[PDB]
Design a protein around this ligand. Sequence first.
Ligand SMILES: O=C(O)C1=C[C@@H](O)[C@@H](O)[C@H](O)C1
Length: 263
Amino acid sequence: MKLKSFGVFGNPIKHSKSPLIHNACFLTFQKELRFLGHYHPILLPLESHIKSEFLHLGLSGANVTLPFKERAFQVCDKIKGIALECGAVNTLVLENDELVGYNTDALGFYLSLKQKNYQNALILGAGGSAKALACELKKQGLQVSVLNRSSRGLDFFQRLGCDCFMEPPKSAFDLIINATSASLHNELPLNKEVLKGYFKEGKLAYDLASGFLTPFLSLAKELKTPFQDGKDMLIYQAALSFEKFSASQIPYSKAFEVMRSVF
Ligand SMILES: O=C(O)C1=C[C@@H](O)[C@@H](O)[C@H](O)C1
């Protein structure tokens, strides 16, 4: 019984449903994998260092949550897969003593979306989530607009062909995505009257927070606009992460089955 250590770095961190669904899968596939994984939440001080901490804890793999996803992309030894276009890393694997960075948010988000027929999207936020979601939605051929408070990640989104606005675009969007940290603060990501304008005219309000009904989602619910929280995304990207942690031994669709059940 070789033991292998995993975790999720975040700040804040201990509401994470991730250790439960990953340890479920580490328990289930012990025999295929030929080790027992264990997965813990990890409070990472803002002023620490993801790579150094990873090496010091002896981890075989990690997930990375806000606000460290852009930092993870910068400090990895090597970036593979769609991560390269996301400028954000949410999955870390030790491969050949090199810290390798993946992004499973993009495809995780893709798989959570039950409908295809959205023309355009407004993304709120500019962290690693917004970055992966913009990259995924452009890929699908939506028009993507991005609105942050201030000047953050301008160049990244510009270079994808996103329209980066200063003020709220006066325009209808099918898909309104909250990828800010606002729900965490129990806050709306935008002035309320503005958001209501988007909601009266949009097709789906989408919040990355999972579990609790956020101010953003509850206002969409109040206006009767269809809404979706981050639960389905969370299960998909975890499954996809797990496929990485398994060094491609266990395909994400098998992980997803155990994970969705347990959740
Ligand atoms: O709440 C969590 O544990 C996570 C949320 C997302 O940011 C994911 O990208 C991350 O892998 C895990």
